[PDB]
Amino acid sequence: PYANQPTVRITELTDENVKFIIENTDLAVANSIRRVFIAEVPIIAIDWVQIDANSSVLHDEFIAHRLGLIPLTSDDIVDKLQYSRDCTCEEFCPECSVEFTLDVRCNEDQTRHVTSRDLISNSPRVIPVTSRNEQDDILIVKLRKGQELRLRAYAKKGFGKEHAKWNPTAGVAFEYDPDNALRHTVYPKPEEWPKSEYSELDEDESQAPYDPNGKPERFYYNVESCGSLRPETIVLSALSGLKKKLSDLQTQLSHEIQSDV
Amino acid sequence: MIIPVRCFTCGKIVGNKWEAYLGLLQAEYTEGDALDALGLKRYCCRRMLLAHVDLIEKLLNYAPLEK
Amino acid sequence: ATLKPSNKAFEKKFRFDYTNERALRRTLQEDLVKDVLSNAHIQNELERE
Amino acid sequence: AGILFEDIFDVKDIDPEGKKFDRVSRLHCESESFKMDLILDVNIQIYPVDLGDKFRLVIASTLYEDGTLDDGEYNPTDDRPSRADQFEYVMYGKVYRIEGDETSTEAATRLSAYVSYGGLLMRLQGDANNLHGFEVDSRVYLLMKKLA
Amino acid sequence: MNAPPAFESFLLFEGEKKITINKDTKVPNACLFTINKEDHTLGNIIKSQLLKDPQVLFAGYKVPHPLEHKIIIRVQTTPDYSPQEAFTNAITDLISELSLLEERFRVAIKDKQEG
Numbered sequence: 157p158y159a160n161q162p163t164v165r166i167t168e169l170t171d172e173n174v175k176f177i178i179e180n181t182d183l184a185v186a187n188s189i190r191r192v193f194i195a196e197v198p199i200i201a202i203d204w205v206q207i208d209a210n211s212s213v214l215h216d217e218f219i220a221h222r223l224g225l226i227p228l229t230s231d232d233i234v235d236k237l238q239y240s241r242d243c244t245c246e247e248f249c250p251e252c253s254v255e256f257t258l259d260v261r262c263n264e265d266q267t268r269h270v271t272s273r274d275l276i277s278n279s280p281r282v283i284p285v286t287s288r289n290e291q292d293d294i295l296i297v298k299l300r301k302g303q304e305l306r307l308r309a310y311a312k313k314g315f316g317k318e319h320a321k322w323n324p325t326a327g328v329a330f331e332y333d334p335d336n337a338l339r340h341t342v343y344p345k346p347e348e349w350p351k352s353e354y355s356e357l358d359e360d361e362s363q364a365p366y367d368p369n370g371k372p373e374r375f376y377y378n379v380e381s382c383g384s385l386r387p388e389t390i391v392l393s394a395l396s397g398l399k400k401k402l403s404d405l406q407t408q409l410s411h412e413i414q415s416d417v
Numbered sequence: 418m419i420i421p422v423r424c425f426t427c428g429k430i431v432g433n434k435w436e437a438y439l440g441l442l443q444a445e446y447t448e449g450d451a452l453d454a455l456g457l458k459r460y461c462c463r464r465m466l467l468a469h470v471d472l473i474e475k476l477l478n479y480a481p482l483e484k
Numbered sequence: 485a486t487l488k489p490s491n492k493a494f495e496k497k498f499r500f501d502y503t504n505e506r507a508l509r510r511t512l513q514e515d516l517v518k519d520v521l522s523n524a525h526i527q528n529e530l531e532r533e
Numbered sequence: 534a535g536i537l538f539e540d541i542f543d544v545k546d547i548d549p550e551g552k553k554f555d556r557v558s559r560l561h562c563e564s565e566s567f568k569m570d571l572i573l574d575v576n577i578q579i580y581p582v583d584l585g586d587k588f589r590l591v592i593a594s595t596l597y598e599d600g601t602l603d604d605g606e607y608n609p610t611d612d613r614p615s616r617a618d619q620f621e622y623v624m625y626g627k628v629y630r631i632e633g634d635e636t637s638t639e640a641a642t643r644l645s646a647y648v649s650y651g652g653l654l655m656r657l658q659g660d661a662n663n664l665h666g667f668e669v670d671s672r673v674y675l676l677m678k679k680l681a
Numbered sequence: 682m683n684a685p686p687a688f689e690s691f692l693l694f695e696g697e698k699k700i701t702i703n704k705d706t707k708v709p710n711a712c713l714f715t716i717n718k719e720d721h722t723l724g725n726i727i728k729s730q731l732l733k734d735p736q737v738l739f740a741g742y743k744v745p746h747p748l749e750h751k752i753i754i755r756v757q758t759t760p761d762y763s764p765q766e767a768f769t770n771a772i773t774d775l776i777s778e779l780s781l782l783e784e785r786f787r788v789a790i791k792d793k794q795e796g
């Protein structure tokens with residue numbers, strides 16, 4: 157009649173991805189955790205652009221969208237910054253946004269590659285991932301001799317539910333029950349399917365025997381970060397975000413019970 | 418037109434991989450070895466780099482509107 | 485149900501047999517059985533039907 | 534105390550006409566105390582059954598050891614003494630047909646009761662003297678337990 | 682032309698009760714929790730955590746429509762219990778799960794970073 161006692165075991169941790177295993181937890185909890193990893197982890201992404209000059213072959217909406225998809229370092233600042241909607245300021249301020257600026261002109265005869273390295277931010281903590289000192293710089297647009305591109309962007313705090321640019325993951329490999337013991341899938345020819353990397357079976361075997369008393373446990377994860385948040389910070393922010401969502405829901409629930417009590 | 422920034426499917430950054438991919442092709446790499454060297458394991462990201470047509474380089478051959 | 489059946493089947497399936505006391509006893513209750521066997525008006529009505 | 538049948542059914546065959554489904558198998562069984570053929574559909578995935586096994590089948594109208602009708606509702610928070618605890622496999626179905634060898638004049642000596650456990654069908658055929666409590670449109674249970 | 686703003690999925694439009702409790706009259710000790718601006722992320726966990734409660738006879742959730750951003754959770758408990766109390770304990774238990782999982786994840790991260 158109470159909660160379970162989940163455990164965790166990290167099998168790999170790098171700057172790009174984190175591979176871990178959660179045990180003694182429900183499939184609903186593990187799936188919600190994955191959904192938070194994908195849609196409800198706030199990060200900093202350009203969400204406001206003012207094109208002061210754009211003579212390139214790509215129209216303004218194209219440049220805006222392309223800047224929006226550029227990931228920005230959001231490791232420790234995203235927890236400090238608030239949502240522009242909740243901020244009580246005027247258009248912007250350092251508490252709710254990060255100013256960026258771009259001013260490039262192709263004076264030489266060679267094509268000028270406007271890259272993420274040209275995005276100058278007012279805050280040194282929020283910079284393009286390629287700009288954090290390997291990987292090359294993201295390409296915003298190529299310019300021809302005589303063309304110019306000058307704009308002024310502002311980054312905001314958001315999560316995946318608002319737009320995919322605020323999704324900090326580049327893939328969340330969620331898996332459970334590598335050996336089909338629970339038979340949640342039914343392979344018509346189990347011998348034709350390959351073995352999961354987390355599978356523990358001899359090559360002569362195809363799938364584990366059926367377990368009537370089995371329940372989904374030991375969920376395997378591989379959270380590849382896009383660069384904005386460290387792979388482990390994505391998980392911590394996801395757990396904290398889901399706990400905050402449940403806490404606010406509990407507040408509204410209690411306010412509704414006492415409404416009738 | 419220009420190489421996208423994220424992979425449409427997963428979201429992996431690919432915008433910074435186009436130039437490296439071309440440099441590898443000129444470096445006598447196969448498209449598969451190049452996509453592996455760039456760290457593109459999912460076939461969705463491999464689709465992004467392998468099916469791209471860089472038209473921007475041809476749009477830059479036309480004189481601009483302003484000099 | 486009274487188009488294809490042959491004359492024999494038609495009669496065996498549709499003519500109410502009110503002379504088989506055993507069958508009447510099984511299908512109908514004692515009061516109905518006795519009434520059907522004794523009363524002749526009911527039998528005549530069944531035949532007319 | 535509501536029990537409408539109780540007899541052992543040595544399993545004589547499983548899926549004689551061939552395996553039609555995967556998580557279900559048809560068992561053709563015969564008893565020894567009453568000589569009653571039985572065609573049953575069970576969930577061999579969770580309750581496997583092998584050729585030659587021997588089980589006790591107890592078709593009852595209620596699970597409560599004391600005579601008391603059931604409400605047909607799923608209430609797992611009921612701690613009263615139920616006869617299901619003493620068995621392994623328990624089903625819940627309804628009688629949807631009772632055939633027999635009755636003629637226009639002679640009564641039925643041999644009967645064949647059909648029951649449907651949410652699709653899993655059973656045909657219990659034998660002597661009518663032992664299948665008098667079986668009536669159509671009556672919710673019944675199975676209470677099948679494998680013994681050695 | 683008719684595309685709803687993306688923030689409509691999570692942001693309440695205005696004067697919108699985040700959660701509404703409606704007593705179900707079909708059966709006793711049952712209620713419907715209509716939560717606005719939520720989805721399967723919370724509906725699934727709350728359903729599962731209520732199913733884990735032995736005093737909960739029925740626990741289910743649904744999204745009436747994908748375009749709408751509302752969710753309905755039906756909860757039926759034993760007469761000695763209450764659906765509101767069940768929903769409160771389920772949320773408290775989910776919160777404890779996330780707190781404990783977060784703590785153990787911090788510990789694992791530290792142990793892995795050191796060695």
Ligand SMILES: [Zn+2]
Binds near residue numbers: 243244246249250
């Ligand atoms: Zn502000």
Ligand SMILES: [Zn+2]
Binds near residue numbers: 429461463
């Ligand atoms: Zn991809």
